[PDB]
Amino acid sequence: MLSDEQMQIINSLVEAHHKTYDDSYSDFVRFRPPVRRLSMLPHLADLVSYSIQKVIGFAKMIPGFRDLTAEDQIALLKSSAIEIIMLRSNQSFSLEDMSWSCGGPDFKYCINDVTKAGHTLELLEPLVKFQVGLKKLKLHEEEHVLLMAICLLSPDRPGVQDHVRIEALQDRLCDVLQAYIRIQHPGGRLLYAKMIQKLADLRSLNEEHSKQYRSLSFQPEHSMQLTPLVLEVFGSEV
Amino acid sequence: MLSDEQMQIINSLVEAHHKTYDDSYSDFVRFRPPVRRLSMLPHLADLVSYSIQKVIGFAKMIPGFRDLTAEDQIALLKSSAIEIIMLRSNQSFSLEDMSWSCGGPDFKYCINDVTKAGHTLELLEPLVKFQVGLKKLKLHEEEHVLLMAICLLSPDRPGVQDHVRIEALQDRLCDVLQAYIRIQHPGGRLLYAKMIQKLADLRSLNEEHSKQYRSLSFQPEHSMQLTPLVLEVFGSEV
Amino acid sequence: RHKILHRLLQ
Amino acid sequence: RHKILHRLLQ
Ligand SMILES: C[C@H](CC[C@H](O)CCO)[C@H]1CC[C@H]2[C@@H]3CC[C@@H]4C[C@H](CC(C)(C)O)CC[C@]4(C)[C@H]3CC[C@]12C
Ligand SMILES: C[C@H](CC[C@H](O)CCO)[C@H]1CC[C@H]2[C@@H]3CC[C@@H]4C[C@H](CC(C)(C)O)CC[C@]4(C)[C@H]3CC[C@]12C
C-alpha cells in the first residue's frame, strides 16, 4: 500500500504533465506549415522546439529537480530531451494508424512524413517500433508520467556532477513506480521490467538521433532551418 | 549618352534584382503565420530572414562584390542588410494603403501589424515616412536597383578592410546612376540629390533598428523567436 | 552559453 | 563565426 508521500509524488507528476501536454494541440497552427525530402523539416523543427519548452516546464515541476544546480538541470535536459519527447509523444500515437494524431488532418504524421526532416529509416524504423511496443503496454497515466520523470532524472548522463543526489531522486521515483504497479495494476508482475527495457530502447534512439543530428548541424543550409532553442539543446557546448 | 560598359552594369543589376525579388510572394505561406504586442514577431522574423537570403543572392551578382574578400562581403551585408530590405520593400508599398501588399490578404502589412514585433514607433514612424518619400520619387527600376547596389557597396561601414576597392566599385555605380538620370529621366535634375538623401535616411533607420534589436536580443524569450540567420546577421560578432 | 535554457529554467 | 553567411556566399 502506497504512503501519502509516495502518493503526493504521483499527484505532483500528474499535475505537471497535465499543465504541459496540451490535448487540444491548438499551438500547432503556429508552426511553419507542414509540406508533404527535407520538406517537413521547418514544421518538425518547430514541433520539436515547442516540445522542448514543454519538457522544460515538466522538469521544473518534478519534486527535487529545481533544487539541483543550474548546470545539472541543463545537463539532464540536454541529454534526455529527445527521449522525453519520444516518450510523451506516445499519447498521440495510434496502433490503428501507425501515426501520431495531433488534432486536425494537417497534424497527423505518418512514417512517410517524419522521414522528410533530414533523418533516415535507421532512426525512424526503431522509433515507430518503440511506439507500438510502448502503446501495447497500456500504461496508466501515473505509470507514464513516472517513466518520464525517471528518464529525465537518470544520473548516468554526460555532464551531471551531483550523481548521488539525482540517483537518490531517481530511486525514490522507481520505488513509487514499483509499488504503484504492484498495488494498482492488475496483471502487472512483468510490467516494471518492460518499462526499464524501454528506457534502454530510448538510449539507443537517442544515440541514433544525436549521430544524425550532427549531419544536419554540419550543413548550414539545413541547420539554418532549425530554431535557436533546438540549436542550444542539441548542440555540443558544455 | 551611356557607354556599353555602363549599360552592361545596368543590365546585370536588373537581372540580379529580377532573379531574387519574387513578385508572386508565393514563399510567404511558408512563414510562421501572422497573428493580429509581440504577436507578429514569428511571422516578421521569418519574413526578414527570407529577405536576408534574397539580399545575399542579389549582392552576389553585383559586378565586383564576389571578388572582395569573404570578410568584406560579410561586413558589407551585416551592416547594410536591414537597409536593403527597407529599400527593396518599396516595390510592395502603396501610398493609397500606407501598407506593404505582398500577395494575399494575410500578407498585407499596416503600421498596426509592424508595431507588433518588438519594435516601437520611433523606428516605425520614420520607416513609413521613408517609404512614402521614396515612393513619391517614382524611380525607374534601373534607378531602384542602382540605389540598392550603391547602398550595399558603401565603404563607410564598420568592418570593411579594402575601403579603396569598394569605394571604387561604388563610384562607378554612382557615375552610372547620374548619367542614367540625366539621359533617361525627364525632369530628373534634382533626383540624384534626393536619392543620396534617402541613403542618409537609411543610416538613421539602421541605427534605430540596431539599438532596438539589442533589446530583443537581450531578452532570451524574444530572441528564441528569431531565426539562426537573423541572429548571425544582426549579431555583434566580428 | 545556454542563454535560452537558463532563462526558461527561470 | 558566421557559418550560415559563409555558406550562402558559397
Ligand atoms: C510528432 C511527434 C510528437 C507528437 C506529440 O504528441 C506532440 C507533443 O510533443 C514527434 C515525437 C518524436 C519526433 C521525432 C524525433 C526524432 C526526429 C527529431 C528531428 C528534430 C531535428 C531535426 C532537430 O533533429 C525531427 C524529426 C524526428 C524524426 C521527429 C519527428 C516528430 C516526432 C515523431
Ligand atoms: C513587410 C516589409 C517587406 C515587404 C517586401 O516587399 C517583401 C520582400 O522583402 C518589411 C520591410 C522592412 C520591414 C521592417 C524592418 C524593421 C523591423 C525589422 C524587425 C526584425 C527583427 C525582429 C529581427 O528586428 C521586424 C519588424 C520590422 C519593423 C520590419 C517589419 C517588416 C518590414 C516593414
Quote the CA–CA distance of B228 and B222 in Å, as a whole number. Answer: 13
Quote the CA–CA distance of A12 and D5 in Å, as a whole number. Answer: 46
Query: CB under 8 Å to B223, separation ≥6 — which residues?
Result: A228, B216, B217, B231, C3, C4
Quote the CA–CA distance of A60 and A62 in Å, as a whole number. Answer: 6
- Write the secondary structure of chain B as one string of H (helix), E (strand) and C (coil): CCCHHHHHHHHHHHHHHHHHCCCCCHHHHHCCCCCCCCCCHHHHHHHHHHHHHHHHHHHCCCCCHHHCCHHHHHHHHHHHHHHHHHHHHHHHEECCCCEEECCCHHHEECHHHHCCCCCCHHHHHHHHHHHHHHHHCCCCHHHHHHHHHHHHCCCCCCCCCCHHHHHHHHHHHHHHHHHHHHHHCCCCCCHHHHHHHHHHHHHHHHHHHHHHHHHHHHCHHHHCCCCHHHHHHHCCCC
Residue length of chain D: 10
Burial of B190 (0-12, 13-18, 19+ CB in 10 A): exposed
Quote the CA–CA distance of B139 and A200 in Å, as a whole number. Answer: 66
Instruction: Check residue A32 and report its DSSP letter.
Output: P
3-class SS shares of chain D: helix, strand, coil, % to 5: 60, 0, 40
**Rounded to the nearest 5°, which phi and psi values hold at B63?**
-55, 120
Sequence-distant contacts of B20-26: CB under 8 A, at least 24 apart: B20/B54, B20/B55, B20/B57, B20/B58, B21/B54, B21/B88, B21/B91, B22/B54, B24/B103, B25/B92, B25/B102, B25/B103, B25/B104, B25/B107, B26/B103
Q: Which helix (H) or strand (E) holds A46?
A: helix A41-59
Closest residue by Cα to residue A40 from A92, A110, A91, A131:
A110
Quote the CA–CA distance of B35 and B117 in Å, as a whole number. Answer: 10
Query: CB under 8 Å to A168, separation ≥6 — which residues?
Result: none
Query: CB under 8 Å to A63, separation ≥6 — which residues?
Result: A9, A12, A169
Q: What angle do CA A219, A225, A228 make, to 5 degrees?
A: 105
Please count the other Cβ atoms lying within 10 Å of the Cβ belonging to residue A220: 19
Closest residue by Cα to residue B168 from B155, B178, B156:
B155
**Rounded to the nearest 5°, which phi and psi values hold at B118?**
85, -5
Please count the other Cβ atoms lying within 10 Å of the Cβ belonging to residue A218: 10
Quote the CA–CA distance of A131 and A147 in Å, as a whole number. Answer: 14
Query: CB under 8 Å to B74, separation ≥6 — which residues?
Result: B159, D2, D5, D6, D9
Quote the CA–CA distance of A51 and A81 in Å, as a whole number. Answer: 9
Q: Is A104 left (phi over 0), alpha (psi -120 to 50) or beta?
A: beta
Helical pair B191-218 and B70-88, crossing angle rounded to 10 deg: 100
Query: CB under 8 Å to A118, separation ≥6 — which residues?
Result: A38, A41, A212, A215, A216, A222
Please count the other Cβ atoms lying within 10 Å of the Cβ belonging to residue D9: 17
**Rounded to the nearest 5°, which phi and psi values hold at A94?**
-130, 130
SS3 of A125, please? Answer: helix
Burial A55-75 (b: 16+ CB within 10 A, else e): bbbbbbbbbbbeebeeebbbb
Residue numbers in B near A31 (CB within 8 A) = 32
Instruction: Check residue A62 and report its DSSP letter.
Output: S
Cβ–Cβ gap B221/C6 under 8 Å: no
Instruction: Give the N- to C-terminal CA distance of chain D in Å, as an integer.
Output: 15
Q: How was this one solved? A: X-ray
B233 contacts chain D (CB < 8 A): yes
Quote the CA–CA distance of B30 and A33 in Å, as a whole number. Answer: 6
- Ligand 1 atom closest to residue A209's alpha carbon, by position in its atom list: 16
Alpha-carbon torsion (A106, A111, A116, A117), positive or negative: positive
Quote the CA–CA distance of A116 and A42 in Å, as a whole number. Answer: 10
| Residue B172 identity | R
Cβ–Cβ gap C5/A232 under 8 Å: yes
SS3 of A216, please? Answer: helix
CA A79 to ligand 2 center in whole angstroms: 37
C-alpha cell at A163: 550523481
**Which value, in Å, is the radius of gyration of the alpha carbons in chain A?**
18
Distances (CA, A) of B99 to A46, B113, B219: 29, 10, 29
Which residue reads 503556429 in cell numbers? A30
Residue numbers in D near A223 (CB within 8 A) = 3-4
Residue length of chain A: 238
C-alpha cell at A218: 554540419
Distances (CA, A) of D8 to B16, B52, B56, B227, B233: 16, 10, 7, 15, 12
| Residue B133 identity | G
CA A49 to ligand 1 center in whole angstroms: 9
Q: Whose CA is nearest to atom 12 of ligand 2?
A: B86
Q: Which helix (H) or strand (E) holds A94?
A: strand A93-94
C-alpha cell at B57: 543572392
Residue numbers in A near C8 (CB within 8 A) = 53, 56, 229
Query: CB under 8 Å to A186, separation ≥6 — which residues?
Result: none
Q: CB of B177 within 8 A of CB of B147? A: yes
> What's the order of all strands across the beta sheet hosting B108-109?
B93-94, B99-101, B108-109
Mind telling me how many Å the CA of C4 is from chain B's nearest CA? 5
SS3 of D5, please? Answer: helix
For chain C, the maximum distance between any two Cα atoms, rounded to a whole number of angstroms, is 15
Mind telling me how many Å the CA of A232 is from chain B's nearest CA? 10
CA B202 to ligand 2 center in whole angstroms: 13
Burial of A167 (0-12, 13-18, 19+ CB in 10 A): middle
Quote the CA–CA distance of A196 and A202 in Å, as a whole number. Answer: 10
Query: CB under 8 Å to B234, separation ≥6 — which residues?
Result: B78, B81, B82, B210, B213, B217
Q: What is the dihedral of CA A62, A63, A66, A69, to 10 degrees?
A: -110
Instruction: Give the N- to C-terminal CA distance of chain C in Å, as an integer.
Output: 15
Which residue reads 499543465 in cell numbers? A19
Task: Give the one of B70, B229, B237 whose C-beta lies nearest to D9's C-beta.
Answer: B70
Q: CB of B231 within 8 A of CB of B177? A: no
Query: CB under 8 Å to B176, separation ≥6 — which residues?
Result: B2, B6, B9, B10, B146
